[PDB]
A paper describes a structure:
Calmodulin (CaM) is a Ca2+ sensor protein found in all eukaryotic cells that regulates a large number of target proteins in a Ca2+ concentration-dependent manner. The protein consists of two homologous domains (also called the N-terminal and C-terminal lobes), containing two Ca2+-binding EF-hand structures each, connected by a flexible central linker. Melittin, a major component of bee venom, is a 26-residue lytic peptide, with the amino acid sequence GIGAVLKVLTTGLPALISWIKRKRQQ. One of the several proteins that induce helical conversion in melittin upon complex formation is CaM, which binds melittin in the presence of Ca2+ with a Kd in the low nanomolar range (∼3–60 nM) and forms a complex with 1:1 stoichiometry.
The relative orientation of the two lobes can be characterized with the virtual dihedral angle defined by the four Ca2+ ions because the inner structure of the two Ca2+-binding lobes and thus the position of the 2 to 2 Ca2+ ions within them remain identical in different complexes. This dihedral angle is very similar in the pfCaM/A and hCaM complexes (118.0° and 117.5°, respectively), while it differs significantly for pfCaM/C, where it is 125.5°. In the pfCaM/A complex, two residues form contacts with each hydrophobic pocket; Ile2 and Leu6 interact with the N-terminal hydrophobic pocket, while Leu13 and Leu16 forms hydrophobic contacts with the C-terminal hydrophobic pocket. Based on the anchoring residues, this complex can be classified as a 1-5-12-15 type complex. In contrast, in the pfCaM/C complex, Leu6 and Leu16 could be identified as N-terminal and C-terminal anchoring residues, respectively. Analysis of the secondary structure of the peptide in the complexes with DSSP showed that in the hCaM–melittin complex and in complex pfCaM/A two helical segments of melittin are intersected with a short turn in its so called kink region, while in melittin in the pfCaM/C binding mode even this segment remains part of the bent helical structure. Although melittin is in a different conformation and binding position in the different chains of the pfCaM complex, there are two salt bridges that could be observed in both conformations: Lys21 and Arg24 formed a salt bridge with Glu14, and Glu120, respectively in both pfCaM complexes. It contacts the exterior of the C-terminal hydrophobic pocket in pfCaM/C, while it is more solvent accessible for binding mode pfCaM/A and in the hCaM–melittin complex. Multiple potential anchoring residues were found in the crystal structure of the pfCaM–melittin complex, while only one arrangement of anchoring side chains could be observed in hCaM–melittin crystals.
Author numbering:
A (entry chain B): 3 to 79, 84 to 146
B (entry chain A): 3 to 78, 84 to 147
C (entry chain C): 2 to 75, 84 to 145
Write the structure that this text describes.
Amino acid sequence: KLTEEQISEFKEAFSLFDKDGDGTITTKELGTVMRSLGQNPTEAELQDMINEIDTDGNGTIDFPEFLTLMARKLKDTELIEAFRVFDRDGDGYISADELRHVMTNLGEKLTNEEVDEMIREADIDGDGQINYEEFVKMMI
Amino acid sequence: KLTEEQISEFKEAFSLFDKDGDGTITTKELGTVMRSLGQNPTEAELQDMINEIDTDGNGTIDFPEFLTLMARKLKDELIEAFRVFDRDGDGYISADELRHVMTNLGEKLTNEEVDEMIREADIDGDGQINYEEFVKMMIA
Amino acid sequence: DKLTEEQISEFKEAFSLFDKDGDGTITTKELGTVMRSLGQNPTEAELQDMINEIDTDGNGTIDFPEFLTLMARKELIEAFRVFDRDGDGYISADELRHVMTNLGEKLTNEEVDEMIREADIDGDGQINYEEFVKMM
Ligand SMILES: [Ca+2]
Ligand SMILES: [Ca+2]
Ligand SMILES: [Ca+2]
Ligand SMILES: [Ca+2]
Ligand SMILES: [Ca+2]
Ligand SMILES: [Ca+2]
Ligand SMILES: [Ca+2]
Ligand SMILES: [Ca+2]
Ligand SMILES: [Ca+2]
Ligand SMILES: [Ca+2]
Ligand SMILES: [Ca+2]
Ligand SMILES: [Ca+2]
């Protein structure tokens, strides 16, 4: 039962990868996103990833091909690496500016209060920062 | 009497380890590189390796620390690495096998450059690198 | 009461962790090397201030008697943070062993495990801030 909010989330996800917004994700854009989260896939590995879901033989990911990538590679059940990515100064917490820096690096423009609202939504213990438990919760 | 070519070789070597190119080698990058050559060092073993040469107490390898690592651990084991290179196990390393090893190591080389590497290391002129030629190549 | 030769030897070993060329004096450069091996990045002026405080005769370096005088004297949450490298709030066996190796006292896993177990109060296998302060 597809609904509009689901599609909006899919499109936000796709925008996180399609940096120039030209409708397809290239190997460069995919590799950039994977680098921003602490990984170094090679040109050949990225071409392999895209080739497994490419349907029109152009070496780039369009929207349905991206949804298929999600279906194939995402699973319910590595996390500490992502937390460390967000946790810039290594104090065990993700501050508002650290979240803002990650968001910005992903091409997302959020105002100060918007980042604070994200933090507040995910901040259970109310200390003003995101720890590992809260990060895992907001990621699943 | 350090020379420009030697510094270029030191930096090529360091680039083989500093995958993200941020100036220092982490335990993650060192472990990835060592796994690419058929070894499974543990987190603690990698931390120990870096600790024996660490001069600024951050658990990562910078350039002088990397040169010191070379001076300490290089000596005047090879069969495992050769087997790693020899993908199809026929006792020879072809151009595509060498090219894949190069790619996996984050090295971007054109086709003719790989052929020139073969030409340099292929003594008996058969167009592939056997074990003797592989060992001799890892000295010059 | 006179010191034993083993006492003097241990004092000289601790001094030699700073006086690394073994010429009997600790310069600002050598103290900086130590502090950097610990992860800190003190400026030359901070190092000079440390020296000045400890250099009672004013010749610009620390010698063995001045070092001993400092030893007779004993926040420290920064010293703890220096040992706790991953910042999880505890000092692990690997962390203590690595710190000591960088300082110049290479210890074995066995020795460090035993040493931490002897200083371990709550018995969780790691030295927390309170145990660190209590030992100090
Ligand atoms: Ca694009
Ligand atoms: Ca496509
Ligand atoms: Ca943080
Ligand atoms: Ca929180
Ligand atoms: Ca690096
Ligand atoms: Ca280092
Ligand atoms: Ca082969
Ligand atoms: Ca040959
Ligand atoms: Ca000295
Ligand atoms: Ca003096
Ligand atoms: Ca720790
Ligand atoms: Ca304890």
